[PDB]
Design an enzyme around this catalytic site. Structure first.
Site, PDB file in Angstrom:
ATOM      1  N   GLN A  98       9.642 -11.958  -8.983  1.00 12.89           N
ATOM      2  CA  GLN A  98       7.780 -11.493  -9.058  1.00 12.89           C
ATOM      3  C   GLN A  98       7.342 -11.755 -10.585  1.00 12.89           C
ATOM      4  OE1 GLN A  98       6.302  -7.609  -7.838  1.00 12.89           O
ATOM      5  NE2 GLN A  98       5.096  -9.133  -5.754  1.00 12.89           N
ATOM      6  N   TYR A 184      -3.188  -6.089  -8.204  1.00 13.63           N
ATOM      7  CA  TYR A 184      -3.723  -7.068  -9.907  1.00 13.63           C
ATOM      8  C   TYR A 184      -3.826  -8.256  -9.440  1.00 13.63           C
ATOM      9  CZ  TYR A 184       0.132  -2.861  -9.124  1.00 13.63           C
ATOM     10  OH  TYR A 184       0.443  -1.623  -8.979  1.00 13.63           O
ATOM     11  N   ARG A 231       3.098 -12.794  -3.061  1.00 17.82           N
ATOM     12  CA  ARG A 231       2.392 -12.196  -2.470  1.00 17.82           C
ATOM     13  C   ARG A 231       1.397 -12.066  -2.478  1.00 17.82           C
ATOM     14  NH1 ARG A 231       5.228  -5.658  -2.140  1.00 17.82           N
ATOM     15  NH2 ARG A 231       5.884  -5.641  -0.272  1.00 17.82           N
ATOM     16  N   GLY A 321      11.069  -1.773   0.939  1.00 24.12           N
ATOM     17  CA  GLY A 321      11.428  -0.842   0.004  1.00 24.12           C
ATOM     18  C   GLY A 321      12.384  -0.067  -0.674  1.00 24.12           C
ATOM     19  N   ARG A 322      11.603   1.169   0.002  1.00 23.41           N
ATOM     20  CA  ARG A 322      12.611   2.505   0.009  1.00 23.41           C
ATOM     21  C   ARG A 322      13.686   2.813   0.629  1.00 23.41           C
ATOM     22  NH1 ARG A 322       6.582   5.143   1.432  1.00 23.41           N
ATOM     23  NH2 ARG A 322       6.651   3.654   2.519  1.00 23.41           N
TER      24      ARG A 322
HETATM   25  C1  LIG Z   1       8.709   2.713  -5.617  1.00 18.66           C
HETATM   26  C2  LIG Z   1       8.046   1.920  -5.652  1.00 18.66           C
HETATM   27  C3  LIG Z   1       7.866   0.792  -6.618  1.00 18.66           C
HETATM   28  C4  LIG Z   1       6.883  -0.313  -5.350  1.00 18.66           C
HETATM   29  N1  LIG Z   1       6.788  -1.507  -6.594  1.00 18.66           N
HETATM   30  C5  LIG Z   1       6.619  -2.921  -6.102  1.00 18.66           C
HETATM   31  C6  LIG Z   1       6.218  -3.571  -7.088  1.00 18.66           C
HETATM   32  O1  LIG Z   1       7.143  -4.268  -8.145  1.00 18.66           O
HETATM   33  N2  LIG Z   1       5.320  -4.938  -6.468  1.00 18.66           N
HETATM   34  C7  LIG Z   1       4.923  -4.740  -5.231  1.00 18.66           C
HETATM   35  O2  LIG Z   1       4.163  -6.369  -4.711  1.00 18.66           O
HETATM   36  N3  LIG Z   1       5.229  -4.058  -4.679  1.00 18.66           N
HETATM   37  C8  LIG Z   1       5.751  -2.712  -5.373  1.00 18.66           C
HETATM   38  N4  LIG Z   1       5.922  -2.236  -4.231  1.00 18.66           N
HETATM   39  C9  LIG Z   1       5.352  -1.813  -2.710  1.00 18.66           C
HETATM   40  C10 LIG Z   1       7.176  -2.510  -1.835  1.00 18.66           C
HETATM   41  O3  LIG Z   1       7.101  -3.896  -2.243  1.00 18.66           O
HETATM   42  C11 LIG Z   1       6.957  -2.294  -0.512  1.00 18.66           C
HETATM   43  O4  LIG Z   1       6.087  -3.683  -0.449  1.00 18.66           O
HETATM   44  C12 LIG Z   1       6.810  -1.208   0.232  1.00 18.66           C
HETATM   45  O5  LIG Z   1       7.479  -0.513  -0.280  1.00 18.66           O
HETATM   46  C13 LIG Z   1       7.163  -1.336   1.368  1.00 18.66           C
HETATM   47  O6  LIG Z   1       7.353  -0.380   1.773  1.00 18.66           O
HETATM   48  P1  LIG Z   1       8.661   0.233   2.247  1.00 18.66           P
HETATM   49  O7  LIG Z   1       8.764   1.417   1.171  1.00 18.66           O
HETATM   50  O8  LIG Z   1       8.038   1.646   3.510  1.00 18.66           O
HETATM   51  O9  LIG Z   1       9.761  -0.502   3.392  1.00 18.66           O
HETATM   52  C14 LIG Z   1       6.632  -0.798  -5.068  1.00 18.66           C
HETATM   53  C15 LIG Z   1       6.781   0.354  -3.951  1.00 18.66           C
HETATM   54  C16 LIG Z   1       7.051   1.491  -4.484  1.00 18.66           C
HETATM   55  C17 LIG Z   1       7.545   2.649  -3.336  1.00 18.66           C
END
Ligand SMILES: Cc1cc2nc3c(=O)[nH]c(=O)nc-3n(C[C@H](O)[C@H](O)[C@H](O)COP(=O)(O)O)c2cc1C
Length: 362
Positions: A98, A184, A231, A321-322
């Protein structure tokens, strides 16, 4: 269980639909913003994901808004990323990088020259970013009021995207994901609340989308359309960036424009972590009719909601993500309906191995 069935994503084939969401973990080496063997191991542990989407990665030094976020612009970043992609590949994985520019979600202290970060307009994000204190620990800091990009600076932004994609190719990434979401740079252009320009990059939706589409065109030209995903977070509010009073119409404009490029995928960040109104299936349908590549959904998905929406033909894959943070073998765990490791959110950002590579596999 369509979640564990293959999926062609542009130039590659994911063996399942359980994708690792891009997850900023802020563990890169500074100076240099360099991926580490530790990050290599974290990605390798997660190499069963149908697709790994990396943490957001700077297209350029100017793109930096977070301390500990990696870049893909320098030879050392390219070399370090090469190992990380080779590790994922050694495990028969696939990894997308990304690529972002953080725009106004940034702080002058990590900008080239200590200068104000750039954006569409000179408006504060009114949020925090994550810097590192003198011990190398993550700290939250109010974002710096940005400088409005000059018209003549726009082609350089486009070229940074194009160059970073050439770099991603060399580094052995399978795909790239343009970060046009979550408040962003690309998103700051898109949104009328953050874009108050009166040249051809502001005002109308066509003008607000102009940058991101130039970026898409340059990166498709540079590599190949089937290597490019993007995205967006075009509906709702994300770190203070709303999508304007015509959010739905504007999204659909943007999506139809992206469709013409024949890009590998469209990744939708549906809500902030604080939540927001879910996407209506109606909207989902409108998206799906405008875009003819992979559609990844993300945002507090459960396996059950992913199955639901993938089964409903609305999205192709889910980015977790999490759960991926806490479960390297999330695929096997979801597959076997195993309990998940408890999340330790305190170690999401920064730090080292703990809360990174010490979440056990089954
Ligand atoms: C610790 C953290 C870091 C994240 N970093 C990014 C990032 O690098 N780029 C991005 O598009 N989304 C980022 N996100 C959003 C996640 O890509 C994702 O859309 C979201 O965490 C998905 O939800 P979930 O954690 O409930 O599955 C981040 C989310 C968290 C929790």
């Amino acid at each position: 269980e369509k979640l564990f069935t293959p999926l062609k994503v542009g130039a590659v084939t994911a063996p399942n639909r359980v994708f690792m969401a891009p997850l900023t973990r802020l563990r890169s080496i500074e100076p240099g913003d360099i991926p580490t063997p530790l990050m290599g191991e974290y990605y390798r542990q997660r190499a069963s994901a149908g697709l790994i989407i990396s943490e957001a990665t700077q297209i350029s030094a100017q793109a930096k808004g977070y301390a500990g976020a990696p870049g893909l612009h320098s030879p050392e970043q390219i070399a370090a990323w090469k190992k990380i992609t080779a590790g994922v590949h050694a495990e028969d994985g696939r990894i997308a990088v990304q690529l972002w520019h953080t725009g106004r979600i940034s702080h002058s202290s990590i900008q080239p020259g200590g200068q104000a970060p750039v954006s569409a307009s000179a408006l504060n994000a009114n949020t925090r970013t994550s810097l590192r204190d003198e011990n190398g620990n993550a700290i939250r800091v109010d974002t710096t009021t940005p400088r409005a990009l000059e018209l003549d600076e726009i082609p350089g932004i486009v070229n940074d995207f194009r160059q970073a994609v050439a770099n991603a190719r060399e580094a052995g990434f399978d795909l790239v994901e343009l970060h046009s979401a979550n408040g962003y740079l690309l998103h700051q252009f898109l949104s009328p609340s953050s874009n108050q320009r009166t040249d051809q990059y502001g005002g109308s939706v066509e003008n607000r989308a102009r940058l991101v589409l130039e970026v898409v065109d340059a990166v498709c030209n540079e590599w190949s359309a089937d290597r490019i995903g993007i995205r967006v977070s075009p509906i709702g509010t994300f770190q203070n960036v709303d999508n304007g009073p015509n959010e739905e119409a504007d999204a659909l404009y943007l999506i139809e424009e992206l469709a013409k490029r024949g890009i590998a995928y469209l990744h939708m960040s549906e809500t902030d972590l604080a939540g927001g109104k879910p996407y209506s299936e109606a909207f989902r349908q409108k998206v799906r009719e405008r875009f003819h590549g992979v559609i990844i959904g993300a945002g507090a998905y459960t396996a059950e909601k992913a199955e639901d929406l993938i089964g409903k033909g609305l999205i192709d894959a889910v980015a977790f993500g999490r759960d991926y943070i806490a479960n390297p073998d999330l695929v096997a765990r979801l597959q076997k309906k195993a309990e998940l490791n408890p999340q330790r959110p305190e170690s999401f950002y920064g730090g080292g191995a703990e809360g990174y590579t010490d979440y056990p596999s089954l």
